[PDB]
């Protein structure tokens, strides 16, 4: 059996795993530099076939589910999701876990208004001036937007900062060792299980409260009210607090850390490039000069802000690696992929291929304007949202959310970096990328 190209290093206890934890991007870049479109690296006991370049990526995203499986490519997601969603009906995968029902187009306008309200509640006590930490702020804000939009305003209204803190701990229990076993006796895996337990308790607390004093309107009952009333065969409540919480956690995940970090970086890039920031301000002031609401404009064109978003997403994709499990043997550029092999594509690396994106390390929102339109011409390499079969179905909502949040923030306050521009960075120590702290920013009301 012929060996596939293998990148240098990887002599630590778990091969390349250790380096993947400290510098996954640098590692993946060295794979392409040394190996080309098809290279590999060892992740503990599993070999990862990393595909880069337009041709290999295409094969990767167009592959059928019968060929490249996404189902077991993220073992680190198993302990978070927990016992399969509340409804046992075949693969609820993305169907229920991330039902497009939530992001349905009929409710889109509604969501924008919900998002507007969440931002205002979040900056309600800002006053004329002060400071914030982007991770704390955006991580909390997105817990509110995701819960209010994906579950119900009623439910969100009963949440506070504690839910965000614990949910964060949940997200941090995704160390790469999860590819060895997501249940190893790791400290972060223990803190993860303890966090999930804390979440179940907060929900159980809410369930009780709602049972002691139900709604004075059989109209204002949310999803939780419904699940609480579901009775088993003998009259007993059918769902426990753990079951309900596990489903709520599963649904919110999709609307949390990817939006959270993306909101943080969008602002960061705006501050780093005051000219783009100035263009966005002008555009928003002029655009909202028609008197229409944020729920109106978030669902419509805001070009400058959108190109700043697309560029933020190219340089800082939330998911730096995408995974699949090969369910058969395939040939890609003369290299053989075997059943069981882990197959990956990297938005982090692909989004910066020099030949596809002139000056890949520069912030150039113009890339997406009339001329170049580099996102649409590099359909297999511009991949912040993935591509093909598993293309992010929440893209439209994610973008609407960014338009909504910044339509409120940039028109009410001005932002300045409170630390060196280069000090802002991501923590890539976990499979779930998070913005690193400190990430301090100053604000002052606009005149
Ligand atoms: C700007 C923030 C977001 C980014 C960068 C992002 C990125 C991505 C990426 C790269 C994938 C591909 C995963 C893979 O190929 O294995 C994906 C998939 C997905 N995303 Fe997002 N996403 C974002 C927001 C959202 C939101 C807000 C939702 C809905 C709550 C959502 C729902 C989904 C779903 C359901 C999939 C699975 C698609 C499939 O497997 O067919 N995403 N996303
Ligand atoms: O793709 C994710 C899972 N994931 C893989 N690597 C890191 N996180 C995240 N995500 C992507 N967009 C939004 N959330 C996902 C996909 C579908 C889903 F229903 C939940 C879920 F967490």
From Swiss-Prot:
Activity regulation behaviour: Inhibited by alpha-ethyl-N-4-pyridinyl-benzeneacetamide (EPBA) and 4,4'-dihydroxybenzophenone (DHBP).
GO CC, alphabetical: cytosol
UniProt GO BP: sterol biosynthetic process; sterol metabolic process
Predominant cellular place of this UniProt entry's protein: cytoplasm
InterPro entries xrefs: CYP450_sterol_14alpha_dmase, Cyt_P450, Cyt_P450_CS, Cyt_P450_E_grp-IV, Cyt_P450_sf
Keyword set includes Transport: no
Keyword Oxidoreductase (UniProt): yes
Keywords: Cytoplasm, Heme, Iron, Lipid biosynthesis, Lipid metabolism, Metal-binding, Monooxygenase, Oxidoreductase, Steroid biosynthesis, Steroid metabolism, Sterol biosynthesis, Sterol metabolism
Enzyme class: oxidoreductase
CDD domains xrefs: CYP51-like
Compartments it resides in: Cytoplasm
Catalytic activity: a 14alpha-methyl steroid + 6 reduced [2Fe-2S]-[ferredoxin] + 3 O2 + 5 H(+) = a Delta(14) steroid + formate + 6 oxidized [2Fe-2S]-[ferredoxin] + 4 H2O
Residue numbers binding heme b: 70, 74, 95, 324, 390, 392
Protein origin, superkingdom: Bacteria
Molecular function, one GO term: sterol 14-demethylase activity
Cofactor requirements of the protein: heme b
EC number(s) recorded for this UniProt protein: 1.14.15.36
Family of the protein in this entry: Belongs to the cytochrome P450 family.
Self-association state and partner proteins as the record states: Homodimer.
Function: Sterol 14alpha-demethylase whose physiological substrate is not known. Accepts electrons from the iron-sulfur ferredoxin Fdx encoded by an adjacent gene. In vitro, catalyzes C14-demethylation of lanosterol, 24,25-dihydrolanosterol and obtusifoliol, to produce the 8,14-dienes stereoselectively.
Name recorded for this polypeptide: Sterol 14alpha-demethylase
Source organism phylogeny: Bacteria, Bacillati, Actinomycetota, Actinomycetes, Mycobacteriales
Gene: cyp51
């Amino acid at each position: 059996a012929v060996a596939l190209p293998r990148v240098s290093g990887g002599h630590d206890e778990h091969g390349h795993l250790e380096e993947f934890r400290t510098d996954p991007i640098g590692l993946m870049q060295r794979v392409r530099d040394e190996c080309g479109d098809v290279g590999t690296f060892q992740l503990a006991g599993k070999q990862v076939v990393l595909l880069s370049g337009s041709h290999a990526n295409e094969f990767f995203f167009r592959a059928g589910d019968d060929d490249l499986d996404q189902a077991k490519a993220y073992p680190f997601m198993t302990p978070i999701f927990g016992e399969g969603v509340v409804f046992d009906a075949s693969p609820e995968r993305r169907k229920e876990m991330l039902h497009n029902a939530a992001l349905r187009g009929e409710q889109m306008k509604g969501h924008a208004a919900t998002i507007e309200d969440q931002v205002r509640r979040m900056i309600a006590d800002w006053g004329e001036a002060g400071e914030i930490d982007l991770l704390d702020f955006f991580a909390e804000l997105t817990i509110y937007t995701s819960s209010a939009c994906l579950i119900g305003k009623k439910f969100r209204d009963q949440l506070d900062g504690r839910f965000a803190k614990l949910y964060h701990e949940l997200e941090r229990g995704t160390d790469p060792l999860a590819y060895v076993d997501p249940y190893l006796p790791i400290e972060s895996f223990r803190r993860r299980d303890e966090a999930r337990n804390g979440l179940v308790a907060l929900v159980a607390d809410i369930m009780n409260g709602r049972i002691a004093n139900p709604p004075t309107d059989k109209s204002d009952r949310d999803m939780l009210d419904v699940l609480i009333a579901v009775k088993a065969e003998t009259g007993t409540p059918r769902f426990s607090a753990d079951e309900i919480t596990g489903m709520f956690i599963s649904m919110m995940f999709a609307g949390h850390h990817t939006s959270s970090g993306t909101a943080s970086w969008t602002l960061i890039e705006l501050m780093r490039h005051r000219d783009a920031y100035a263009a966005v301000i002008d555009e928003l002031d002029e655009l909202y000069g028609d008197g229409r609401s944020v729920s109106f404009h978030a669902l419509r064109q805001i070009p400058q802000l959108e190109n700043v978003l697309k560029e933020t997403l190219r340089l800082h994709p939330p998911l730096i690696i995408l995974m699949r499990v090969a369910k058969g043997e395939f040939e890609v550029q003369g290299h053989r992929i075997h059943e069981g092999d882990l197959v990956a594509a990297s938005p982090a690396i692909s989004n910066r291929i020099p030949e596809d994106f002139p000056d890949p390390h520069d912030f150039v929102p113009a890339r997406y304007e009339q001329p170049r339109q580099e996102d649409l011409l590099n359909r297999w390499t511009w991949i912040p949202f993935g591509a093909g079969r598993h293309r992010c179905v929440g893209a439209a909502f994610a973008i609407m959310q960014i338009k909504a949040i910044f339509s409120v923030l940039l028109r009410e306050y001005e932002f300045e970096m409170a630390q060196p521009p280069e000090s802002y960075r991501n923590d890539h120590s976990k499979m779930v990328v998070q913005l690193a702290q400190p990430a301090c920013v100053r604000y002052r009301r606009r005149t």
